[PDB]
mmCIF file of C-alpha atoms in Angstrom:
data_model
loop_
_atom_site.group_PDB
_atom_site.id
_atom_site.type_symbol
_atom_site.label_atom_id
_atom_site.label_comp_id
_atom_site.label_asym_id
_atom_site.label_seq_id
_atom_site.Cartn_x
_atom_site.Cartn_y
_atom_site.Cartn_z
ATOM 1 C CA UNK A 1 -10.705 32.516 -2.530
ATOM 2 C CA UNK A 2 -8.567 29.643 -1.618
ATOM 3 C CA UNK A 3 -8.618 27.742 1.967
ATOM 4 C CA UNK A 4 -5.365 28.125 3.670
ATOM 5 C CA UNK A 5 -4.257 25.866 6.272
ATOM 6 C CA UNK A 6 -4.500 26.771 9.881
ATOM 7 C CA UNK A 7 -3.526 23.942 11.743
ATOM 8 C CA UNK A 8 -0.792 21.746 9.573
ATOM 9 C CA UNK A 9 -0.769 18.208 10.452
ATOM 10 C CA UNK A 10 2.671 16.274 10.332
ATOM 11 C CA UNK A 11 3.746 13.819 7.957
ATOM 12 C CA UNK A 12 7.305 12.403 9.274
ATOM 13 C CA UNK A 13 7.259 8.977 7.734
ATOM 14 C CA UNK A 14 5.394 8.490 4.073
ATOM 15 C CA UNK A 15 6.306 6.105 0.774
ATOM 16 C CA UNK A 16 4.649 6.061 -2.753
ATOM 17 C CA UNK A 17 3.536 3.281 -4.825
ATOM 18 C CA UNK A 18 2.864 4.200 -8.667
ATOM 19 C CA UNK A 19 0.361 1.707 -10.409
ATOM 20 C CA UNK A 20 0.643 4.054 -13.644
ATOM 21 C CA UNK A 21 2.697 2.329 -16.484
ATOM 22 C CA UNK A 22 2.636 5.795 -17.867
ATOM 23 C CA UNK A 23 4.735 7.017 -14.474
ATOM 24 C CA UNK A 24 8.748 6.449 -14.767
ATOM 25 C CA UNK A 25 10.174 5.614 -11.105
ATOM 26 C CA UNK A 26 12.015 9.136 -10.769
ATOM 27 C CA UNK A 27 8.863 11.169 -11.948
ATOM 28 C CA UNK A 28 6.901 9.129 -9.092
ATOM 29 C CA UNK A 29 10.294 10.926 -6.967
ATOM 30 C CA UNK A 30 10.431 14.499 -8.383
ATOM 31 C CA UNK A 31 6.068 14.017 -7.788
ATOM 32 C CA UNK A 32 6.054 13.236 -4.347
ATOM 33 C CA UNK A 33 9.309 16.216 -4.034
ATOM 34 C CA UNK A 34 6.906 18.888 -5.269
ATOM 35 C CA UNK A 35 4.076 18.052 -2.871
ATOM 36 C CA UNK A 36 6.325 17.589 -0.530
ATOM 37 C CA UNK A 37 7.414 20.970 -0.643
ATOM 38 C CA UNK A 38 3.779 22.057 -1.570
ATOM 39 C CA UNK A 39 2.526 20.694 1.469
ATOM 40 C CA UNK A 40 5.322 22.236 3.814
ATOM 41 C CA UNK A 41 4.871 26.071 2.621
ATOM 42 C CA UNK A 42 1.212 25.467 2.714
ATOM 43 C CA UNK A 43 1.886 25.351 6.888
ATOM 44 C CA UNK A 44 2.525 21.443 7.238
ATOM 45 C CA UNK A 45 5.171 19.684 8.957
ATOM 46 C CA UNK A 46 6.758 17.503 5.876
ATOM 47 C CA UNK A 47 9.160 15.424 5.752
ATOM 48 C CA UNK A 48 10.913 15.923 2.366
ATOM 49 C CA UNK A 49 12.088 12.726 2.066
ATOM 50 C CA UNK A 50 10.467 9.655 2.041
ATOM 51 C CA UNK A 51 11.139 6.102 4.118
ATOM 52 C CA UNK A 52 11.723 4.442 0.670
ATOM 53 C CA UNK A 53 11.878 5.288 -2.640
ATOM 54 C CA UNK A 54 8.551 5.075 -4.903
ATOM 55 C CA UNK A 55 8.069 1.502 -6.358
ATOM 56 C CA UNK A 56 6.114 0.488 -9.432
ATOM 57 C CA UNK A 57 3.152 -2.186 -9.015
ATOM 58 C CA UNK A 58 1.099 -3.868 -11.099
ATOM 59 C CA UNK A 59 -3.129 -3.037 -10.159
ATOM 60 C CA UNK A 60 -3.333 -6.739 -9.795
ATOM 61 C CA UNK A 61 -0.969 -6.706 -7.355
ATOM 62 C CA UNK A 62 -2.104 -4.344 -4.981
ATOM 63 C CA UNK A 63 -2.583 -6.229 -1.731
ATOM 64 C CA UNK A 64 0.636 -7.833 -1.847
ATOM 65 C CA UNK A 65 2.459 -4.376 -2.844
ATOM 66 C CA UNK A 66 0.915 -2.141 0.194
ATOM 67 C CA UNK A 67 1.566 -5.177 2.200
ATOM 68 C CA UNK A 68 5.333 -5.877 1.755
ATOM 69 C CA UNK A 69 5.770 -2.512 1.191
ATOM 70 C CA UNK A 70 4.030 -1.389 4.456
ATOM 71 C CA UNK A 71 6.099 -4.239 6.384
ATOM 72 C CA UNK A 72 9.500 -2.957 5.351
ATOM 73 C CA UNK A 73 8.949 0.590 5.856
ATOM 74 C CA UNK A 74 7.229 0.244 9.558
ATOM 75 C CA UNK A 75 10.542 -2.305 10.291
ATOM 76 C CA UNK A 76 13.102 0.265 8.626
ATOM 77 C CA UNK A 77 11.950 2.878 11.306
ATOM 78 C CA UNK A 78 10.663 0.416 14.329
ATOM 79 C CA UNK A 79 10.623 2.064 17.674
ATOM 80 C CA UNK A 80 6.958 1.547 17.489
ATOM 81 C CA UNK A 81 6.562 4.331 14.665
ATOM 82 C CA UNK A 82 3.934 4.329 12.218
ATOM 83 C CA UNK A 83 3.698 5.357 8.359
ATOM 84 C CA UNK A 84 1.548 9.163 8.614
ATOM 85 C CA UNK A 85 0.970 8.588 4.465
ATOM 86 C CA UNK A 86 1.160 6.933 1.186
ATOM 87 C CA UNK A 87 0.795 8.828 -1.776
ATOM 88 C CA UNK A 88 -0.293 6.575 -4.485
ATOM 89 C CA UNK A 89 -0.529 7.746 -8.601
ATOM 90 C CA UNK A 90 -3.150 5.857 -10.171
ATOM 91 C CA UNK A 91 -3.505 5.144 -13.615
ATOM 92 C CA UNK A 92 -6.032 7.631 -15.728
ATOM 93 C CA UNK A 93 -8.290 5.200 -16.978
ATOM 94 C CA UNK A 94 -10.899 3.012 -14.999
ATOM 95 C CA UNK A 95 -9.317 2.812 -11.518
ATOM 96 C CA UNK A 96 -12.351 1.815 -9.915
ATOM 97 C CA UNK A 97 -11.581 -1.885 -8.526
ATOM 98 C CA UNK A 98 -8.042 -1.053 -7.555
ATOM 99 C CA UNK A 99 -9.210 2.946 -5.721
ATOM 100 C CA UNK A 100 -11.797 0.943 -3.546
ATOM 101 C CA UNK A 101 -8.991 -1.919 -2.836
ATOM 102 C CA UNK A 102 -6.316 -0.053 -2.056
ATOM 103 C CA UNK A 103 -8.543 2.217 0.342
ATOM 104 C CA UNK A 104 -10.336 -1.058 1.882
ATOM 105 C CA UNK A 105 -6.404 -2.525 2.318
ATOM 106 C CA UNK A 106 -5.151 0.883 3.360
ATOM 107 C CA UNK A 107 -8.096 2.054 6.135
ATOM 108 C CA UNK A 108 -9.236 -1.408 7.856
ATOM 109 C CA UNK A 109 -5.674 -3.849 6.958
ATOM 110 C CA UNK A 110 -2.719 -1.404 7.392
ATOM 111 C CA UNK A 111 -4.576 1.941 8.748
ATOM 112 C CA UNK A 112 -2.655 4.385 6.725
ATOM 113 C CA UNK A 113 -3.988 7.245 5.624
ATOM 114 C CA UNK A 114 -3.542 7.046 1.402
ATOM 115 C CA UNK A 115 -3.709 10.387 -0.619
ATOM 116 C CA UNK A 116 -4.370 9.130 -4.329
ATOM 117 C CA UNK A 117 -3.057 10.984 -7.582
ATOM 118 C CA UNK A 118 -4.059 10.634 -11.238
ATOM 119 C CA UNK A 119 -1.561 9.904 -13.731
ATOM 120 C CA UNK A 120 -2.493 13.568 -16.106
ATOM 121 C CA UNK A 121 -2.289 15.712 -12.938
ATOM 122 C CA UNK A 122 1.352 14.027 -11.645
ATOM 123 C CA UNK A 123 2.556 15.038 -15.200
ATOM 124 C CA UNK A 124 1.663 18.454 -14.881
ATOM 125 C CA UNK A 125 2.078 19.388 -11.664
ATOM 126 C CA UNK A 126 0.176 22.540 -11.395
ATOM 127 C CA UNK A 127 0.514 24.493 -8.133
ATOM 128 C CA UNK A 128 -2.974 24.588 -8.199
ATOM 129 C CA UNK A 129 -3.353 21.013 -8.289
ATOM 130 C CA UNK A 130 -0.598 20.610 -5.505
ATOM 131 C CA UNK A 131 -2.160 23.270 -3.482
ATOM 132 C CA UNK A 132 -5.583 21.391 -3.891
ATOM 133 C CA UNK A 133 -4.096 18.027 -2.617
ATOM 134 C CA UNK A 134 -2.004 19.610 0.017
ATOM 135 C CA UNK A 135 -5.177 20.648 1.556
ATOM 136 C CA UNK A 136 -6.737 17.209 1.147
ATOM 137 C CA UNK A 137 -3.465 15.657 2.743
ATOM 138 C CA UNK A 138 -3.717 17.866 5.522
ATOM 139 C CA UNK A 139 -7.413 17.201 7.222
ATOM 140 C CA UNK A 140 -6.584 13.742 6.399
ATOM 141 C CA UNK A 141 -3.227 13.647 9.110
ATOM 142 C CA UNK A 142 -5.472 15.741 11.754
ATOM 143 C CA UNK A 143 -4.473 18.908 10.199
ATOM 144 C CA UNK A 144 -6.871 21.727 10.076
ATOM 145 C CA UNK A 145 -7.718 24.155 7.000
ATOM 146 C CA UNK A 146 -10.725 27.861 6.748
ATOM 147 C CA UNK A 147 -13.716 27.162 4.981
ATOM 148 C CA UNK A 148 -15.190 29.793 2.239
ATOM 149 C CA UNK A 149 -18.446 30.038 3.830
#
């Protein structure tokens, strides 16, 4: 069977940065939409829009992207309010130097929780694959979901 959710986390504040040069900036939008609205039916308090719209990086640029990009969301909202996620799309092939960078910058620099994407999957957008990362997203904000066994 599939896990459910049983406790669903919030997400009030979240961005996207696409490092896929495969990824258009308004499929990065219509993306982060659907799980979005995956995530909300799924039992999650979601925002459905985001603090800014999705940007396009370069991989070599990935400190100074989550950085800036980090600054000028957290000073859009101030009032001491943090970013709950960032929903990155990474590029199919080898992503192994910029996944462990981005989660180094993201966990002990900015500490955001980051939900990562691959390129094939955002394409698609099966609501299996939505459900499956809706579940991921949610135990990552504090959320709670069954187990099977």
């Amino acid at each position: 069977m599939n896990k459910k959710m049983i406790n669903g986390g919030t997400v009030n504040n979240w961005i996207c940065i696409n490092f896929s040069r495969q990824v258009q900036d308004n499929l990065a939008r219509t993306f982060c939409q659907e799980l979005a609205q995956m995530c909300y039916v799924s039992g999650m308090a979601f925002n459905p829009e985001p603090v800014l719209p999705p940007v396009s990086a370069r991989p070599e640029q990935v400190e100074k992207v989550l950085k800036t990009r980090y600054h000028d969301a957290t000073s859009k909202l101030s009032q001491g309010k943090e970013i709950d996620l960032l929903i990155v799309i990474l590029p199919d092939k080898k992503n192994s130097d910029l996944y462990g960078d981005l989660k180094r910058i993201c966990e002990t620099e900015l500490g955001i929780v980051s939900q990562c994407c691959l390129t094939k999957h955002v394409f698609k957008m099966s609501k299996q694959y939505m459900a499956n990362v809706a579940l991921k997203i949610n135990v990552k904000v504090g959320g709670r979901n069954t187990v099977l066994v």
